[PDB]
Design a protein around this ligand. Sequence first.
Ligand SMILES: CCCCCCCCCCC(CCCCCCCCCC)(CO[C@H]1O[C@@H](CO)[C@H](O[C@@H]2O[C@@H](CO)[C@H](O)[C@@H](O)[C@@H]2O)[C@@H](O)[C@@H]1O)CO[C@H]1O[C@@H](CO)[C@H](O[C@@H]2O[C@@H](CO)[C@H](O)[C@@H](O)[C@@H]2O)[C@@H](O)[C@H]1O
Ligand SMILES: *P(=O)(O)OCC(C)(C)[C@H](O)C(=O)NCCC(=O)NCCSC(=O)CCCCCCCCCCCCC
Lengths: 74, 670, 60, 80, 98, 68, 17, 85, 73
Amino acid sequence: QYDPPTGWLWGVRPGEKYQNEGWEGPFFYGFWGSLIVFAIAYAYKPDTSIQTWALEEARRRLEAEGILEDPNPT
Amino acid sequence: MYLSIIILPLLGSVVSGFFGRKVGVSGAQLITCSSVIITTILSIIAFFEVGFNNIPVTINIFRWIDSEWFIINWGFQYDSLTVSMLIPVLIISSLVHIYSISYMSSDPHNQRFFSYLSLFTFMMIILVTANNYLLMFVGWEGVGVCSYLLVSFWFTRIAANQSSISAFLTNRVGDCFLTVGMFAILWSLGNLDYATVFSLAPYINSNVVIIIGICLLIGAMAKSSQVGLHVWLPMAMEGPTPVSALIHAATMVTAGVYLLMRSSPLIEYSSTVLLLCLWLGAITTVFSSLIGLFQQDIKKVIAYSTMSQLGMMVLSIGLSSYNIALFHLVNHAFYKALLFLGAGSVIHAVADNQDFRKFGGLISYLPLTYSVMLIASLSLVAFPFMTGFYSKDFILESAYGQFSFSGVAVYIIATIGAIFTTLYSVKVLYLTFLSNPNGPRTYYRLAIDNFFSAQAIKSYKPAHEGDFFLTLPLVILALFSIFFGFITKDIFIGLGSNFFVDNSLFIHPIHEIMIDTEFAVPVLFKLLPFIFTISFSVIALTLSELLSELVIYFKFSRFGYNIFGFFNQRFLIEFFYNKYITNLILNLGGQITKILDKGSIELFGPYGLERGLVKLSKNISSLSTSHVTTYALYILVGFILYLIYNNLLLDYSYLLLIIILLLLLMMIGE
Amino acid sequence: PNITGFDMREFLRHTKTPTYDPWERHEAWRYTGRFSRFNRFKGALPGFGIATVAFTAYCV
Amino acid sequence: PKIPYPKHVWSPAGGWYAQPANWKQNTAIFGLVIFGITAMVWKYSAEHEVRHKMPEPDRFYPSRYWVKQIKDYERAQKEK
Amino acid sequence: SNRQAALSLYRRALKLALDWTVHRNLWRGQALYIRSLFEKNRNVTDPRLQRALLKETEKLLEKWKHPDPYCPPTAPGGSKYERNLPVPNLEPPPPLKF
Amino acid sequence: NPPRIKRQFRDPHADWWDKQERRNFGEPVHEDHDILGMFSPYEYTWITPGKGLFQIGLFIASFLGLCY
Amino acid sequence: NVEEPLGAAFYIAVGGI
Amino acid sequence: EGLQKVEVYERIKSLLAGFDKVNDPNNITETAHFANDLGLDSLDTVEVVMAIEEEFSIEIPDKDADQIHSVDKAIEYILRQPDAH
Amino acid sequence: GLQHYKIAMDPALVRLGSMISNRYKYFRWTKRTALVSFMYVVVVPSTIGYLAYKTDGLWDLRAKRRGDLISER
Ligand SMILES: CCCCCCCCCCC(CCCCCCCCCC)(CO[C@H]1O[C@@H](CO)[C@H](O[C@@H]2O[C@@H](CO)[C@H](O)[C@@H](O)[C@@H]2O)[C@@H](O)[C@@H]1O)CO[C@H]1O[C@@H](CO)[C@H](O[C@@H]2O[C@@H](CO)[C@H](O)[C@@H](O)[C@@H]2O)[C@@H](O)[C@H]1O
Ligand SMILES: *P(=O)(O)OCC(C)(C)[C@H](O)C(=O)NCCC(=O)NCCSC(=O)CCCCCCCCCCCCC
């Protein structure tokens, strides 16, 4: 035999319900909400890292060698 | 398929562990076991894909760590070593998952148990499928966290707590050298991808290869529990028996062996690390067999047998024969699990007893259990024509086949290890089933005899066999231990097989011993371990239920008493580890906390300055009397002293000397 | 030596099955038909008997 | 028997002997979630699994039916 | 005093003979030999000798101590001991805010 | 300060307020109470380390004997 | 035999993916 | 579901009958004392508990091995320990 | 501030914690102690620092092939 799952999440007994303390709206809609909105906006932030700039040049530098057959024969 | 093999066991664990309230017990088992059966199916397919076709596959998902020269990727490469290593891991994990449905069916926390073994599964795949050493280390660190979490599953038991600290800390001592070894690889190569490390290894400084290989050896020594960092493994048996089969018998302990096999292109270019490989394993395989004979717990004997066969794997790598080590690592996995799982049904049949002193006669009570444990025992002893025979016995031939001093030396070193393996094999098999009853009535009191007047319904419980979920893995694992070695002996051993031709297992022409092993070894040496096994097994049967006094005479002989306790107490290694390493580390901390950080640092510092400066200030306050004559005299003293300093053209050192010297008087009381 | 009359050799000399003990009637059950020297090894090699007949048939 | 335990303790792994009355209905829901993203992992893998060797046409190789880097090769070789 | 301790060492003696000799046939002969030793010195009366006699056999129990004695799984030191310990306090927490 | 002994060596079967720890409630404690309790490095009491080192040395002698 | 809701955490994790 | 009164009595009854030193198998009851009722002595009775512990797979501490001196106390002491199998 | 749960406050354990908290006031410069303080504050850092001085620039692994050496000094 098995028992049904039990317990008081957040310590709220089955008779009662959870009571808001005052930090919930600011934390969920503000701090967490801003962090999510920041995440999607980060997906559109243009790339500004030194690698992707240097990969482009280094690609050309190795292209003018025996490595990395370039698309155009100039 | 090649990213779904990786990810699927992770999903089962997350649902079983974070939503086990919602899926319940049987739902959590259904999800976790299905995710492992399906992952097993694909890894069998991926074997035919990669191995039988020589088509390795590469998956790069995204980059993990990008910093200048170092570009570590979340990336996965399947090769001949990867798919071969994934077969025992996934097959045994599937069976142990099925085994656990009926084994842990009494334990309350049953969602957490199934989530952990499905999390261990994920990590063991992460380890062997990585592109580089650092992504391999995520699985290595994660297997240690999963082994810790399962050795301390019964966390209200202090014994399980101490055995889990030992497992987690001993394995970090190896990871320190493993982490330093990767630092040496990054220093000398600018990356640690397998492709870059192994392509450039022949041209790299011989000394840095020794430095790198030594660190890889010490890390591999801890997780494969070789003769130095071995104490955590027998302690790992505090966890549930199915954990002991999957993690401490066939998969996690084989990670160190996989590391040397994976690193073979690098370590082939330094004979020094192969010589230490050849002697670490030889010492370990005999250090283990000598201990397992004297253990009174069944699981302790099987753990010690695991480390002897792990030494046999390490010794083979020292012979630079990584194909045999892979063949033995795979063949050992199948029969060792059957031994742990078969023993697990023995402990379950009795009232969870684990002492040999309370078993015997159980052959009529556990007919299937005895038969599968007998099959597993012959493969472990390398009885001819069995799965374990083709693998381990060939390492012995290879050891002598390498016609060197060390090779012949460790053939001798390992032939005693073969002898004592037979002796523990007999002890487990005889004392459990074939011996006279040493346990109480309850284990044996069948219902044929009445023995009861009004309570005939209950109180019998005469150590029955298991159920379907408990025995089905035992039957499946039995087939492998009879036939699997023969079917696959061409893939790994062969004579010229081309299975690992993606530079997966690299062997250099210079010290290859395959041709001489099959031709130069005399016939007697090839067949010698079989002779020594039959001879030493009948004697063990003859010295128990046939003569059986000589052991009692020896156990009370003054000399035999000490060596019984020397080997029962595991070469006294743990005794010297605690009082000279962990207690010394604990006493060093005590010195710093009590004498330094709550002692002299306070006194020669803030508290001392605070104590003295209060004293000094009170003394200067004493000169304050509010008497004008005293204060006039102070003024006159200071007036004439300024005349002394200026008119006499004194050195300023004198003035500084006086000032300090006056503070030292004022510091002095009265 | 050994003011208590314990001698290890005589301890060892008394290491056997005693001719008389106050306890056979409770201990005798262990050395019985179920746990005889013969019935205990009756199936030490479970499938050996059948395989021998089958192997002979294949040879012929 | 069955170990007594507090009924006031909430666990995400369930608790002590936790089996919900709807275990099957929720196991079905979670099994669909696992299958759903496993297929997504399958889709991503098939597109980025890179090989340097092409399997023989007569050989058992179920990868041939989804992975793109050799699916196009088979049709490219089917042009002569 | 001088009576309970004598009986305790009797059990320790029989326990240690079985712990070393696993075979129940053979410990039975050993156990019968031990009972003779306890029976032989039954009539010792002087407390000075009694304390000395008890002290000596404690060394014998130490001189042939087993490297690991048998311990039932539920016993302290057994394999199953403290395995699934229940919570001590089954009552719910009192109403407090943290 | 009470005598410094690991609490391993108390009676498991005695009446203890904390049976797991083997300690009574008012019981005085050592300044090393943290590393003297049940959850602490086990104290192996088989033999003295002086004899223990000797026994290991004989195995090293045997191992070198086979090497020669 | 109390029923179990899937629960907001199920949708937060699933919705996040 | 645990150990019952009828189970322990019939199991213990078949045990002390294994002596060749008791007065008679018919002289043992629930309230039979180890010394006054049935025939044992100081040294035999401690061997009984060292067989009772073996055949219930428990451990009898020395402090509790002395109060046990009659069959009735043996019956109730077993029922107090839930570890008995 | 806010009240907590009821704790069986062990008098021995709370006086051990008070002694450990207050231990700094009773330290003295004795024969053994100056050796302990000198060993761990001076000797051990001095040894570690000296070996760092004598090995600084000594080795480099960066791209050492067969034919070069780890040593540079
Ligand atoms: C857990 C095991 C660890 C060890 C595993 C095996 C290690 C094997 C290599 C050890 C290694 C590198 C260590 C690298 C450490 C950095 C990386 C650390 C790891 C983290 C990434 C030690 O190199 C040192 O060797 C010492 C001994 O000679 C000397 O030390 C200094 O002594 C004083 C000098 O003024 C200073 O006062 C003192 O302060 C220093 O110490 C120096 O020579 C050198 O620094 C290299 O050893 C090799 O170095 C070369 C060139 O030197 C030398 O070769 C020889 O050269 C000619 C004769 O010269 C011969 O004609 C030639 O034929 C032969 O080739 C030998 O020396 C050789 O042995
Ligand atoms: P019942 O017989 O219980 O009455 C006991 C009485 C009250 C008579 C006391 O025993 C008594 O007063 N006797 C006389 C004084 C005394 O206290 N004697 C105690 C017994 S001395 C004794 O028995 C000596 C031998 C002890 C055992 C030696 C061997 C120990 C075991 C070695 C094992 C080695 C490994 C297997």
